Design a protein around this ligand. Structure first.
Ligand SMILES: [Zn+2]
Ligand SMILES: [Zn+2]
Ligand SMILES: [Zn+2]
Ligand SMILES: [Zn+2]
Ligand SMILES: [Zn+2]
Ligand SMILES: [Zn+2]
Ligand SMILES: [Zn+2]
Ligand SMILES: [Zn+2]
Ligand SMILES: [Zn+2]
Ligand SMILES: [Zn+2]
Ligand SMILES: [Zn+2]
Ligand SMILES: [Zn+2]
Ligand SMILES: [Zn+2]
Ligand SMILES: [Zn+2]
Ligand SMILES: [Zn+2]
Ligand SMILES: [Zn+2]
Ligand SMILES: [Zn+2]
Ligand SMILES: [Zn+2]
Ligand SMILES: [Zn+2]
Ligand SMILES: [Zn+2]
Ligand SMILES: [Zn+2]
Ligand SMILES: [Zn+2]
Ligand SMILES: [Zn+2]
Ligand SMILES: [Zn+2]
Ligand SMILES: [Zn+2]
Ligand SMILES: [Zn+2]
Ligand SMILES: [Zn+2]
Ligand SMILES: [Zn+2]
Ligand SMILES: [Zn+2]
Ligand SMILES: [Zn+2]
Ligand SMILES: [Zn+2]
Ligand SMILES: [Zn+2]
Ligand SMILES: [Zn+2]
Ligand SMILES: [Zn+2]
Lengths: 172, 172, 172, 172, 172, 172
């Protein structure tokens, strides 16, 4: 037992390890997306920049959980980072839809983590999730839904003009 | 009778109370409009900002009338602020049309207030309305008509692209 | 169903709509109070300023709930804003007592909202209320009780001198 | 009953009074430790500074609880501050171990306070503890465990060189 | 025997330990007073600030004696800090009277310490008390007597107006 | 075939995809190492910082290869990022040895990539590897060997003092 460990259930410890993996997986998905937009035959630089920024943020989300595991006296066990479900993301609209889906899945995992923490009477962990993760997810999900809406309204993905103008005016 | 009251008819006093209500109602309408554009399934941030600014201006219009009522030694009697006629404003074009209609209704009420003031030989009140309210209404009505015109010309509301580009280039 | 909606109960959605109304009603009460102090026969400018500031803060409280409703994928339904229970607020002391009562009523509604959120396992909403609303209410209620105490100690409302000096030294 | 009191159980009130005492006791322990390091026959100035800073922080922790008691309309009842369990703290390593133990005891008391608050449906108090106290304790406990680890690794307390170099390089 | 000890009687050493306790007790009394004025039903913020500042100064007085004990090669033995004689301090005037009494008691203890030092031919200690403590006590006692006088002259404690105006004009 | 593709062999394309994976794997190894040093029972903050910086650099190495794949008109195919060979890195010295081994393995892969490029008469790719990768690897390998040497000379890993002082004086 770690000398710092206090009120920290082993189940919380394991669930943190799984969340770390999931944030690193979200990072990788966004990385993939980013360089899809950099292809010469896609060529939407601001979509690329947008997803690259996202990739870096997800890495940060993972690192703060790793710091938390050590803070609480848990032990980090890393697992493979799975490659994303696609190589080719099809269009700006499709990538934004896939990111929306992803952020809702990350959010469901976090809500389950909070439920676990409250079930184990770990208010430090429950508040950590509340403070640093839950509203961030809500904002990410809203922003992505806003982006989906606009791209749809504009005529994406059929309108190549729609995606070009969105890239310039919303993401740029 | 207030020690400051001078040349101020009771009918003017009551009509000021009604105008206060109407400016607060205009504020609420615009508030409603603003948060319609903030919905994830509408997502036109500059329409939202535009109407939010309008909401705040209308509050100012109401407060200056409330200050005037006290200046003249009248007494403020507030009434309920009615909720707007719609919950869902349909499109940018439709909201701009509804705001145009609203500002013409606020303007008709103000022109009736000025007529009343002149009928009661209250040049202070007539000039207050002239100076602070009438040209403001004329400008608001012109700007809204300009916005309606452009949105129509661009193909709104059917063109989701039209509303997006207007949001970016005119309201943004 | 909104594409962003996640873990958000319909009962939470409706209770947010009711809280929005209540914050707008608190705004209106304070507005009324403010212009009571601006009357020539009351003439306590810093009480007026104090309540006017309060009115504006309450509007902000309402707008942030409206933003939250859209963030979570709920739908805003606005209701009439009821006029306040009084036209004439009697004295500085009486208005401060009435504001105290009001803020405790706003606080009870918020504590009921938090209970609902926790009952629906919505930690995002529970934390939103905690973070942005609960301590604000506690502070407002303390400050108002401090003001009541002092005004009472000084001899308000009978001492017209008491209210004048409080206006100058505490509110000014 | 205080005019500001709302949703505040008497049991919460008493537990806050006990926590105030405990934070003042933690302050005194650290004060004792600090001046142990200032002895001519111990002479580790940065250990002294470290614990003195800690003493001052604990006083702050206590004052913010006293402010909270008054905010909620509870009443402060102070109790004697017990002298610490030792006069002579033996070594840098031993003092750091004793501080670790102390901070885990302060943390257990705070987790019990949070449990009580949640049991009484006092989300204001539960969040106050979360926001201002729980992560602070987690960080303090981590830092102290880090210090214990290093001092042990370096050969403290037998190595007088170890404590000297830690004082200079980690605490200085 | 400490390697630094020189011309330092054991009786001086013990009396320093008792003075340390007394300065920490004075700190606690003032702390209690301060948060009495922060109550919602007392609400005199500048009395609160005044006593809080005093509390912090007394802590400083104690720390400098603890530094002196180590400087001379004496050994610090801390004792419990007794809780103050009251929980409720009644009024501004009463608290100022109680502080006056307290500072005269701290001063009598210091004059006895100086007598002891001179009896033991310890001019370093006698001068330390002279330089750092005696005039400070004289000033504190004068200031407190000045405050008592004014509050009495103004009609405290019956005049709630008197205490309010003193708080604003003398302590604020 | 990409419209930009010129003088770019399919074998080069695949080898770039494998190098991307390897740089992401190097990133993950260093990430693991970093948070090993952050454990309360290891507690070497500058080792942690050193490896964290390394992790971020490796991510950069991978991103520049991904940019290169798109520049040349190749297609990115991402693979899982394998978890590192250890969870527990044992000591500063052991982690530095493991990083040395890793950087020599990354370097062997890069030298094989350069051989392939020259065999396919792709001077753009050969020079890209030369310019951006080969000397970087040489420097990394030298620095790591320098660190191993010093830690060994100092008595690591048995001397807990050795690792502490290296952390402070070389990595800090
Ligand atoms: Zn994200
Ligand atoms: Zn994330
Ligand atoms: Zn796989
Ligand atoms: Zn799905
Ligand atoms: Zn995310
Ligand atoms: Zn919380
Ligand atoms: Zn307008
Ligand atoms: Zn208007
Ligand atoms: Zn109605
Ligand atoms: Zn009409
Ligand atoms: Zn208008
Ligand atoms: Zn308020
Ligand atoms: Zn409010
Ligand atoms: Zn009504
Ligand atoms: Zn009531
Ligand atoms: Zn309020
Ligand atoms: Zn601490
Ligand atoms: Zn503490
Ligand atoms: Zn005792
Ligand atoms: Zn124990
Ligand atoms: Zn502490
Ligand atoms: Zn619960
Ligand atoms: Zn003093
Ligand atoms: Zn003193
Ligand atoms: Zn006692
Ligand atoms: Zn006496
Ligand atoms: Zn004193
Ligand atoms: Zn003599
Ligand atoms: Zn002298
Ligand atoms: Zn490297
Ligand atoms: Zn590399
Ligand atoms: Zn594997
Ligand atoms: Zn090998
Ligand atoms: Zn490398």
């Amino acid at each position: 037992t770690s000398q710092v460990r206090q009120n920290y259930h082993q189940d919380s410890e394991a669930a943190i390890n799984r969340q770390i993996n999931l944030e690193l997986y979200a990072s990788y998905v966004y990385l993939s997306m980013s360089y899809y937009f950099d292809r010469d035959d896609v060529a939407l630089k601001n979509f690329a920049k947008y997803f690259l920024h996202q990739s870096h943020e997800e890495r940060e989300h993972a690192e703060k959980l790793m710091k938390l595991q050590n803070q609480r006296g848990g032990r980090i066990f890393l697992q493979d980072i799975q490659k994303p479900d696609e190589d080719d993301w099809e269009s700006g609209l499709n990538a934004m839809e896939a990111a929306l889906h992803l952020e809702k899945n990350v959010n469901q995992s976090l809500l389950e983590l909070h439920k676990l923490a409250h079930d184990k009477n770990d208010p430090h962990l429950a508040d950590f999730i509340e403070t640093h993760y839950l509203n961030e997810q809500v904002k990410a999900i809203k922003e992505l839904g806003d982006h989906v809406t606009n791209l749809r309204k504009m005529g994406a993905p059929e309108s190549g003009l729609a995606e070009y103008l969105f890239d310039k005016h919303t993401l740029g």
